[PDB]
């Protein structure tokens, strides 16, 4: 804990149409980042689904509005990147956010 959710809101984006073995953890995160910062992620390969956490609720909303109109593509596969209705935030029960400061993205202002 004591990490992520830079603003007191949080939103999860769920990404579908993901090929198993073709997408990496990075691709899913890197696709969300361009319009909104990602803090955390949950990968459910069993359901062929990915969940992505955004540092700012605006980040999640802004990116998805873009990706619902212009969705992101991996290896010719069109990923619908969209708001998750099931998850409000990705509650990682694993150690993370150490060393790797995902503060390489606008709306940050100084690494903390």
From Swiss-Prot:
Impact after mutating residue 28 to I: Slightly reduced pre-mRNA-binding
Protein modification: Phosphorylation regulates the subcellular localization. In contrast, phosphorylation of the C-terminal disordered region promotes localization to cytoplasmic ribonucleoprotein granules.
Effect the entry attributes to changing residue 51 to A: Strongly reduced pre-mRNA-binding
Subcellular location per the Swiss-Prot or TrEMBL entry: Nucleus; Cytoplasm, Cytoplasmic ribonucleoprotein granule
Induction of the gene: During early embryonic cardiogenesis.
Expression tissues: Predominantly expressed in striated muscle, with highest expression in the heart. In differentiating myoblasts, expression correlates with sarcomere assembly: expression peaks when alpha-actinin is localized mainly in mature Z bodies within the nascent myofiber and expression declines as the sarcomeres continue to mature. Also expressed in kidney.
Effect after changing residue 82 to M: Slightly reduced pre-mRNA-binding
All copies of domain RRM, residue ranges: 11-86
Gene knockout outcome: Mice were born in normal Mendelian ratios, are viable, and do not exhibit any visible phenotype. They however develop cardiomyopathy and display splicing defects in genes related to calcium handling such as CAMK2D or RYR2.
Function, in words: RNA-binding protein that acts as a regulator of mRNA splicing of a subset of genes encoding key structural proteins involved in cardiac development, such as TTN (Titin), CACNA1C, CAMK2D or PDLIM5/ENH. Acts as a repressor of mRNA splicing: specifically binds the 5'UCUU-3' motif that is predominantly found within intronic sequences of pre-mRNAs, leading to the exclusion of specific exons in target transcripts. RBM20-mediated exon skipping is hormone-dependent and is essential for TTN isoform transition in both cardiac and skeletal muscles.
Oligomeric form and interacting partners: Associates with components of the U1 and U2 U1 small nuclear ribonucleoprotein complexes.
Name the record gives this protein: RNA-binding protein 20
Organism the protein comes from: Mus musculus (Mouse)
Gene, per the UniProt record: Rbm20
């Amino acid at each position: 804990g004591a990490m992520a959710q830079r603003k007191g809101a949080g939103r999860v984006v769920h990404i579908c149409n993901l090929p198993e073995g073709s997408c990496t953890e990075n691709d899913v995160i890197n696709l969300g980042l361009p319009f909104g910062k990602v803090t955390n992620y949950i990968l459910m390969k069993s359901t062929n689904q990915a969940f992505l956490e955004m540092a700012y609720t605006e980040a999640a909303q802004a990116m998805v509005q873009y990706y619902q109109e212009k969705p992101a593509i991996i290896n010719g596969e069109k990923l619908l990147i969209r708001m998750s209705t099931r998850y409000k935030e990705l509650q990682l029960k694993k150690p993370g956010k150490n060393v790797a400061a995902i503060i390489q993205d606008i709306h940050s202002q100084r690494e903390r």
